Write a protein that binds this ligand. Structure first.
Ligand code: NAG
Ligand code: NAG
Ligand code: NAG
Ligand code: NAG
Ligand code: NAG
Lengths: 364, 285, 50
């Protein structure tokens, strides 16, 4: 009170000094049930893969893709992401994801990277410039390797030129490496780019095949359908806490309302466009967003030249959110309620007045 | 294959009036006992909507009409199909309606919902087909000649299997299926509503609010669309391929939307009861 | 290319204005206890330029 009206001695009366405001307790967040999980469990887990020049795409849209259960797997070799960090991936929404399926041999795993040349990186595949994606590799010698010679895979040994970004040359014709076109059997001015790949179960780590899946993202003008999984906390009712259901962020006490919404209506507003009721996504229940308890803190002083005792008035409080007198104007803490009646010395509100009578105290 | 229907009885078009219809819920917000003023793409009250129909009169040369032309799509379209049978099936959308751009395909034959988004080969008239018999006297699907190609489809929404009636009952129309197709910069919002009716050849009067049905995030450029109907081909009308194309009774109404402000009154249970055009007459203002 | 010049590439939170970080603890990327080893989900917080 002294700090409010720039003085060290206040007179008789009721002075507004501050504002009471209940602070939020928790950070309740309720998103809908996780459904329509993106099929990222079949691109990796596949019985039969394809050759390097047969990178079949498995584009997916309108799905919930969890890029975290893939990172935190401890079963891969090089989870090398580009454009985005290997973490915090389930916080971005994309339009469509492009997958790739091919089996490169050993050192060729280091060739699928932005700004890198090689056999695979110039003949079969060709990664473009800066692009948001990631590389996922794992051991292929486990099941793919054939005991006795694994020649089922194919690999383009030599091509005419460098491949175009994200292009698939299915042009399987005998290239003329020598002189005027052979147009027949290979061996004289004749070179088939696709002859074989070759593998062996008695091989090491640098000379063994690997299953690499290059996930390709896209930020087209179309709405971002592919989204990350949104977590969800519990629901504590009858307590002023912060809430975020589907974007409607705010604070308040989530009680149970008797309203009956329509099956498609989620939110609910008042006459002045203020949210008063929402529908929980997971459980179809209608809540009631009541504002957090707040008010004004007034101080009743009989004057510093008479005494130093003061009574606080919490306007608009039910004395359950802060001598405790429950008046129709607030909670008067610091004054005793007497059954007598005198003239009004310091007005409080709703027919209540406070004064300083005799051993000395403040009476309401 | 793309067969070209013929032997159709040409006639000038017909227009009707929309007696305070085409009002939908603008957003997903519950309002009880309040009057909200919303500015969106609504159907102007008392508009000169276009009336298409499909009937076959017996006797003389007759009035064998099968209306399904390409109609523009500026900012929206209203669609109130009024018929007793299940002649109406769905619609097609897109910019050129060929295999050069994306397109939307919503079919509702009596096997499942066929909402798809691809680059189809929609013919000049995407027919449907029902067939009647005398040994097994029951209507069954016969033809699905709508597209004749396949490309990189970006969406697919086949729903649960259902068995409709697909019959050819005669009488007064007792099914009013209203639809509102919108597209705001990223989506294709469909508002649907089904109310009973006991009319014959007119649009009923009253206020019926259309409930939201889907929010397909299929970002495409839609400027043209075309309705799809079914043509009964029984034994009574024989001939070549495009000879027996009887249609029974069928009539759908079209109508476009425009930016207008409406004053919607919400009931205490949270449903719209009436509306004001706000730009129709000085009393409305 | 010199290798003395280093820069931080992995930190828990952002760096407050006018703050120096001279620690060389292994950054735990995923949900895997590093316990002072370099490899998967555990990268060194420094990197040269060249
Ligand atoms: C693939 O299979 C393994 C072993 O069954 C399993 O742990 C994993 O969850 C599956 N999904 C993927 C793609 O990680
Ligand atoms: C969400 O999941 C819970 C628990 O399985 C279930 O009780 C509830 O009905 C589900 N709600 C929706 C919207 O599917
Ligand atoms: C709030 O105060 C009123 C008046 O004293 C009382 O009737 C009511 O029970 C109180 N409610 C709470 C939450 O204590
Ligand atoms: C408008 O309504 C009148 C009366 O129904 C009709 O004659 C006319 O064809 C309609 N449309 C046009 C083209 O003005
Ligand atoms: C509101 O709904 C209740 C039951 O849900 C019904 O009894 C009441 O008549 C409805 N109000 C109106 C007038 O629509």
């Amino acid at each position: 009170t002294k700090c409010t009206l720039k003085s060290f001695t206040v007179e008789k009366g009721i002075y507004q000094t501050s504002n009471f405001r209940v602070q939020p307790t928790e950070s309740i967040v309720r998103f809908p049930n996780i459904t329509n999980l993106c099929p990222f469990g079949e691109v990796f887990n596949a019985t039969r893969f394809a050759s390097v020049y047969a990178w079949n795409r498995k584009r997916i849209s309108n799905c919930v893709a969890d890029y975290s259960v893939l990172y935190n797997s401890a079963s891969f070799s090089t989870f090398k992401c580009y454009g985005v960090s290997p973490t915090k991936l389930n916080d971005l929404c994309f339009t469509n994801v492009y997958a790739d399926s091919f089996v490169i041999r050993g050192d060729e795993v280091r060739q699928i990277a932005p700004g890198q040349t090689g056999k695979i990186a110039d003949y079969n595949y060709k990664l473009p410039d800066d692009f948001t994606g990631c590389v996922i590799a794992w051991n292929s010698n486990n099941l793919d390797s054939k005991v006795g010679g694994n020649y089922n895979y194919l690999y383009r040994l030599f091509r005419k030129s460098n491949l175009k970004p994200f292009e698939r040359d299915i042009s399987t014709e005998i290239y003329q490496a020598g002189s005027t076109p052979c147009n027949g059997v290979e061996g004289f001015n004749c070179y088939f780019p696709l002859q074989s790949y070759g593998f062996q179960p008695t091989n090491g780590v640098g000379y063994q095949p690997y299953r690499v899946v290059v996930l390709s993202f896209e930020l087209l003008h179309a709405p971002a359908t592919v989204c990350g999984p949104k977590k969800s906390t519990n629901l504590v009712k009858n307590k002023c806490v912060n809430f975020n259901f589907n974007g409607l962020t705010g604070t308040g006490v989530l009680t149970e309302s008797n309203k009956k919404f329509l099956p498609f209506q989620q939110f609910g507003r008042d006459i002045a466009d203020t949210t008063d009721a929402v529908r929980d996504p997971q459980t179809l229940e209608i809540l009631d967003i009541t504002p957090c308890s707040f008010g004004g803190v007034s101080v009743i002083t009989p004057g510093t030249n008479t005494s130093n005792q003061v009574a606080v008035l919490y306007q608009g409080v039910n004395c359950t959110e802060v001598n405790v007198f429950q008046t129709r104007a607030g909670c008067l803490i610091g004054a005793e309620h007497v059954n007598n009646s005198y003239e009004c010395d310091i007005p409080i509100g709703a027919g209540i007045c406070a004064s300083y009578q005799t051993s000395q105290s403040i009476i309401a | 294959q793309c067969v070209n229907l013929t032997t159709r009885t040409q006639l000038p078009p017909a227009y009707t009036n929309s007696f305070t219809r085409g009002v939908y819920y603008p957003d997903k917000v519950f309002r009880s006992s309040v009057l909200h003023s919303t500015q969106d793409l609504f159907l102007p009250f008392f508009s000169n909507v276009t009336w298409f129909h499909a009937i076959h009169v017996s006797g003389t040369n007759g009035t064998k009409r099968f209306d399904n032309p390409v109609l523009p799509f500026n900012d929206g379209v209203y669609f109130a199909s009024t018929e007793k049978s299940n002649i109406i099936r769905g619609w097609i959308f897109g910019t050129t309606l060929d295999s050069k751009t994306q397109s939307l395909l919503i079919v509702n034959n009596a096997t499942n919902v066929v909402i798809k988004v691809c680059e189809f080969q929609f013919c000049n008239d995407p027919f449907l087909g029902v067939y009647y018999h005398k040994n097994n006297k029951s209507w069954m699907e016969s033809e699905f000649r709508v597209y004749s190609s396949a490309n990189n489809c970006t969406f697919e929404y086949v729903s649960q299997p259902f068995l409709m009636d697909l019959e050819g009952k005669q009488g007064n129309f007792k099914n009013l299926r209203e639809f509102v197709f919108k597209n705001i910069d990223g989506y294709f919002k469909i508002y649907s509503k089904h109310t009973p009716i006991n009319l014959v050849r007119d649009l009923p009067q009253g206020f019926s609010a259309l409930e939201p049905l889907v929010d397909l995030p299929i970002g495409i450029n839609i400027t043209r669309f075309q309705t799809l109907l079914a043509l009964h081909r029984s034994y009574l009308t024989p001939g070549d391929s495009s000879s027996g194309w009887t249609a029974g009774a069928a009539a759908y109404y079209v109508g476009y939307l425009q930016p207008r402000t409406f004053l919607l009154k919400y009931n205490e249970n949270g449903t719209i009861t009436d509306a004001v055009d706000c730009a129709l007459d000085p009393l409305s203002e």
